[PDB]
Amino acid sequence: VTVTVNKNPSHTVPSTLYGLMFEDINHSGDGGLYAELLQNRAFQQVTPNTAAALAAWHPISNAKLAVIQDPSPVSNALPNSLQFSVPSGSSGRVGFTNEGFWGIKVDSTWTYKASLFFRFPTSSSFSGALTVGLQTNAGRVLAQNSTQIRGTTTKWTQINLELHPTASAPDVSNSFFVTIDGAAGAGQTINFAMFSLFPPTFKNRPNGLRADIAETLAEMGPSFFRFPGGNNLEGQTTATRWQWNATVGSLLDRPGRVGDWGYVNTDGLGLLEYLQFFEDTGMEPIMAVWAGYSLGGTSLAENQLAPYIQQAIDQINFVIGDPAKSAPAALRASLGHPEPFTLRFVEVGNEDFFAAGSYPYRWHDFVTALQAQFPQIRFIATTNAWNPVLSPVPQSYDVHVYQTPTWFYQNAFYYDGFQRNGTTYFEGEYAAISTNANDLFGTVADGRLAFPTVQSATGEAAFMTGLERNSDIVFAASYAPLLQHVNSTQWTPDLVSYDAGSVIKSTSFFAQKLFALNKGDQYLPSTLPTNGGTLHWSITRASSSGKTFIKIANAGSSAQSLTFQLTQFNSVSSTGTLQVLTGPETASNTPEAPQAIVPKTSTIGTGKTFTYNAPAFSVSVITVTTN
Template sequence: MLLWLHLAAGFLSYAGLGTAVTVSISATASHPIPTTLWGQMFEVSYHQPRASSGDGGLYAELLQNRAFQQVTPGTTAALNAWQAVNGANISIIKETTPVSAALPNALHVTIPTGKTGQVGFANTGFSGIKVTAGQTYTASFFYRFPTRSSFRGSAVIGLQTASGQVLGSTTAALSGAQTTWKQITVKFQPNTTPSTTTNIFTVTLDGAAASGQSLNFAMLSLFPPTFKNRANGMRVDIATALAEMGPSFFRLPGGNNLEGQTVGPLVDRPGRVGDWSYVNTDGLGLLDYLNWCEDLNMQPIMAIWAGFALGGTSVAEAQLGPYIQQAADQINFVIGDPAKSAPAALRASLGRTQPFALTYVEVGNEDFFASSTYTYRWHDFVTALQAQFPSLHFIATTNTFNPILSPNPTEYDVHVYQTPTWFAQNSFFYDGFQRNGTKYFEGEYAAISTNANDIFGSPADGRLTFPTMQSAAGEAAFMTGLERNSDIVFAASYAPLLGHVTNNQWTPNLLAFDAGSVYRSTSYYVQKLFSLNRGDEFLPSTLPTQTGTLFWSVVRKKSTNQIIIKVSNTATTSAPLTFVLPFTNVGGSGTLQILTGTATASNTPTSPNLIVPVNSTIATGKTFNFTAPAVSVSVLTFTAQ
């Protein structure tokens, strides 16, 4: 996730001067629009330990630090998110008999003598836990007694408020004779919906009955209902918001987060410290991503690690072999024949015999940071993988045609983070690209700052905390250019997709969230408007002024004879337009969707619906007028043939 920088040109305006801009539209399409044009880029990382876009975000798991992965036993930090209940003694230990080779640590719990009432431990979740009455929660954990004892009793497993009010619970029998690991799985329904998300998950024993007992716990988990009831699935409200956008692809696993063990049982995943300095559980795995793509009818654009570490080191060419094989295994897991490939056989053993759909594989991420070594890494990876998978397209991640790569890439991934003004003034970015067979993936883009001299600075330097109406309108102007150039731009995705409201390393994000809610940004609505109002073919029209503030694109949806016009006005004054159509029959009215507001306004947790699309009816005809409001994105839809 970074950067393609250009200096912003002078900002000129003809909008709001009172003279309507005449837009003449052709009846003859210039090119079909790719079905993959608008989609989503998922970056698992870039967020602080307590809440990320994957763990604590899209991934529905509610417990943080659930398996004590990549922590140092005996330290306070190892107990992150865990706390004692009613005086229990708890610590993270290195197990003498771990639950798996991947998970060497366990939670050691001792019930002190003389205790009464429920005694045990709790998890505070990812900055809280949302609890909803009547929903079914699934909890599980492994336990064992280090030393055989005569204890027999029940653990109470449930959810409470921070003040101790029980919201819902159930019980599970535990035995002191259990000195090997045993998994417990229970379901329960809270009977109360609390007013806040400052709730905790608890596992407790009767203090008197368990006095003096010690036992160990590993791989604890708590799931609410998930999107489409997928096991190990997605958080419903976030998944629903993403589904509402109608995305056609999903770039995974995202950005610089390409490593990790993400297939097989959860208990066999060690987790890892990611590129952004916090532990990834790798709970959200490759199979989950692929199921997610099918659930939303998206194509996966899958990245493979290409031998470059973000710290600046590259694998020497002579040592690439194991990593190329790893990439081949990853691809075979997705599309391989179970009778011929062990990774494909693993996929089949997990319940998926048939291959998934896969067309595009991205080789690395932002390898313009290591262009000098990408030449041999690209060559060796792609040469080997093309021989095994000739139907796949491999996407290069260096700057376009710099350096020159062999074999010649058929697709490039281009990233740009800039100001709203830059995006508006670069709506013609791709118009000058050669039509030489190369296609482009605008894999990451966003207006992130109002300060062209320090776009990666702090909010005090102009960095946006949340997308604004100004930034969304600038992005929309750029997107009209992507649509106009969709003969060579086959896919585009805003980035980053998700970010916790406060616990994050990167702003702005398309969707913000916390433990209880999802907040749709102005940029989210722009992406949704473009995605849900895509056409089959692009219709040429009078071109916007490159240095102006008013931009448009026109598409046709052949199956319904609909003409769809998207308009971005980045000026702080309204802009009149006159549309001239060549069709014999044009509907007398159409629908109008407008997103508009004050330039600096944002949707935030305190005002989540400040700026939302408003629908109305508009008069249309062979010639008709429309005034684009100040700082707005509009979609006009009507029939014509």
């Protein structure tokens, strides 16, 4: 096919076109992007004196463990403590371990920071060393440090110790440990609370993020971060929704919450840590506010909304407000950030097409109040576009789609037929998740993708050429879900996977990165792709440099030739770069073969005319300079 490139741009490409969608799903927060290495660190939201309260914790030797509703808890937010008792007549090493999130990476090039709170609930003559450390799951000690404690310490006391492994472990089957001498400790009871183990963090942020994962997200060159969900915003009930104020301040003051994917969230990855990550990466937030629906099906009545609308105003004030004018903005100042953060976009709820009977009134009351307080923010509606009809008229809608790879190349003209009437669209969740049109959300045996494939990434890329062509009205687009702990999965496929030790960049991650990193501010119209066809392209140009990015998706099983005609330009560089992602149709990056499919960069000859053969199942970017 001959593709004529117009030199005259049709529209400016929004700075926000490509970004990320985050919720704590598949242990993407706890266990994932948040760097904390101990699971169930503070006994949040568990039933005392049950086995589940002790999840991830194990005795060493004859130690007696229980999770208790502490008569004198470490804080209002953390009512539970680990009661540790050493039997009469004990000896040697007695204590307990934490298995981490399916392991702990023990690296001798890393210093770890261990902390806990303890008290003796009954004053005693105990005198001896408390030891913390890391050990292989055989009990082989790799790091250890200790400090002297006394049984006369009946008030809550924090211990802070650094750990330096003598050797890197051969795998991630390691545990954190706390021990005392069994003979010196015989008959003693200690109460513990609020444990923590951190490795070095992204940008050395206190209370920060896991370095490999955060660097992988930054590598993708995102412009926005949609958070905190997603289903994980909503809760199962009003009382279990996400709440911004429970996520800020000391970790002692964060009660956690049962999230929407089977596990407790610490809320250690809270509002200020999200905003700090945006600052560190140059992303802006697309921040959701709870909108009076939870996933057990309860809508708040119209006459119940007021306090929840005020909470949403308080949440935005934390982010942008003048510290002299509100308590939440003074709190941001008090936590070391007096300058407001950037916030231009707020999403009202999540997937309110599930509660379309109530969303008209919830949308109306939330947006009337929030637009009055925040006249510069753009509020995004979550129902299906224009059904039901909302008031006020939404300036933006969030569109989600999970479909087959084939649907994605067949629907690359999704936005071409939309009216241009001042509405902008966020593709806030999309993914090609299955090859089975009959059962998209079924099992891997029934066609669900365990991991993104070449087929699914190339279908996506064809659809993304439409997003870019239609970027006059499409302002933002994110794959979902972003992250996956391969040891605790609730949804596949995911953009980036990991275990406790290493990261797996999917084929779809590479498609996302090739689109995002190779994007100009000018959209250059070109010969249209065949609507329904397997072959798609989108061309942008950087006004400041003339760097021109020709993105090509062949989502089909046939190689296809393209001849580009740049005759309308004055000059075209005599060479260009080619970046290509390709492979067999069903190929994936997996924990066992994490680099099976990776992009290849080369130099090609270019000019006012050149020919490229787009291989079957490929994503290609050709960069040239045009003036």
